Amino acid sequence: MVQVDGGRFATSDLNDLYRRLINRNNRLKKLLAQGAPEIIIRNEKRMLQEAVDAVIDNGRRGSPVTNPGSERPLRSLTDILSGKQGRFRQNLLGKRVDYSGRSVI
């Protein structure tokens, strides 16, 4: 969580999904404690799987987890790893370097 100029923030984006999930777990975890309607818990349970679906591999099933505002799909624990700067490939591909420099030859 990094602060862009002022009180604007750069949240990891994975951090987002990692709440989407804790809110369902605590909703479909309250319902069950006091007042357990059948159909209601069902859809909450269908949601809590779907919430873990998002943290893992957002893009799948079909509906991507949007963010209140934009339709950009936001990255999942899969994307962190799924190449192009994605952990497995970042090294053999990129990395900016600390004793360098250029110029016209």
């Binding site: 602060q3 009180g7 709440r19 804790i22 605590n26 591999d57």
Partner: protein
């Protein structure tokens, strides 16, 4: 000893919790007006590492040879800031949840 092979496996819920250091199965985080991580939430110092290098979140002994210290009210361990790179958390689900990987 020095590494020579790397082996990937599956995660026994007994390990995922063995890793964990604490449970972020509690609210949501980062103060914006202050910069303090919110209690029992995705950055809580109490469960991962101290956000600051050694030192607590109010005032303790900024030592070196004492190894593993937890405070009066708050629960922060005075032991280098790199820790927050590595300490795991966990969310204890209320029911099931399949790894979509092994699903789809």
């Amino acid at each position: 000893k020095e590494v020579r092979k790397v082996r990937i496996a599956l995660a026994s819920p007994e390990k995922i919790r063995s890793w964990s250091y604490g449970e972020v199965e509690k609210p949501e985080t980062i103060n914006y007006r202050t910069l303090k991580p919110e209690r029992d939430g995705l950055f809580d110092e109490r469960i991962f590492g101290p956000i600051k290098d050694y030192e607590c979140a109010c005032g303790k002994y900024k030592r070196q040879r004492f190894e593993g210290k937890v405070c009066e009210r708050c629960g922060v361990e005075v032991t280098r800031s790199i820790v927050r790179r590595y300490r795991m958390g966990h969310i204890e689900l209320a029911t099931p949840a399949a790894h979509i990987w092994f699903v789809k």
